[PDB]
Design a protein around this nucleic acid. Sequence first.
DNA 1: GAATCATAAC
Length: 180
Amino acid sequence: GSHMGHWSQGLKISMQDPKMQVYKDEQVVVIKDKYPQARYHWLVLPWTSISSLKAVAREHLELLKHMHTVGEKVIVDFAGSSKLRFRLGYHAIPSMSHVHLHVISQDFDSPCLKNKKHWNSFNTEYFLESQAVIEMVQEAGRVTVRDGMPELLKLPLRCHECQQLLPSIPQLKEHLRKHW
DNA sequence: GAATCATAAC
Ligand SMILES: Nc1ncnc2c1ncn2[C@@H]1O[C@H](COP(=O)(O)O)[C@@H](O)[C@H]1O
Ligand SMILES: [K+]
Ligand code: NA
Ligand SMILES: [Zn+2]
């Protein structure tokens, strides 16, 4: 198949779709995550094309901080009255091209959370905190990630609120109800 | 049987 039409390039299309955009400025766009992993799940993307955190340098430091600020503004404007906790961050090994910041509520109440990979990609070191990535670019000048990230996606399910271990996705979903 | 697992998508 074509490069432009490959599944991995899908964010490049969505980020230009008015129906998916929730905020735009001179630097970034915010879209709804197409397969959200919680009640509120947005992606913040710069207009400028940066393939992934591997291509990030200090020239992009203001941009990463702006993406974070914009993420926090979307939370306030769209979910401020909700009592929800949010995290902002990056997958250590993304699947989709074009750097994108995840802005995600911590209920994890969603039909798109279907497997252990989904869970662990938001609930282990595989989810790099936005602030951590920002600080690493500032102090080290580039983003590095340790070996062994794929193995994290296979860890036993553990609740992010109370650390209880759960034997299955259905049982995890039932358990998470208690933390609403 | 329900759920998970790895694999496959030409
Ligand atoms: N066309 C699309 N528009 C918006 N979000 C998408 C699209 N395709 C995939 N996604 C989401 O993009 C994220 C890609 O994951 P990752 O590359 O691991 O950061 C996931 O949260 C997907 O649900
Ligand atoms: K199995
Ligand atoms: Na992947
Ligand atoms: Zn719990």
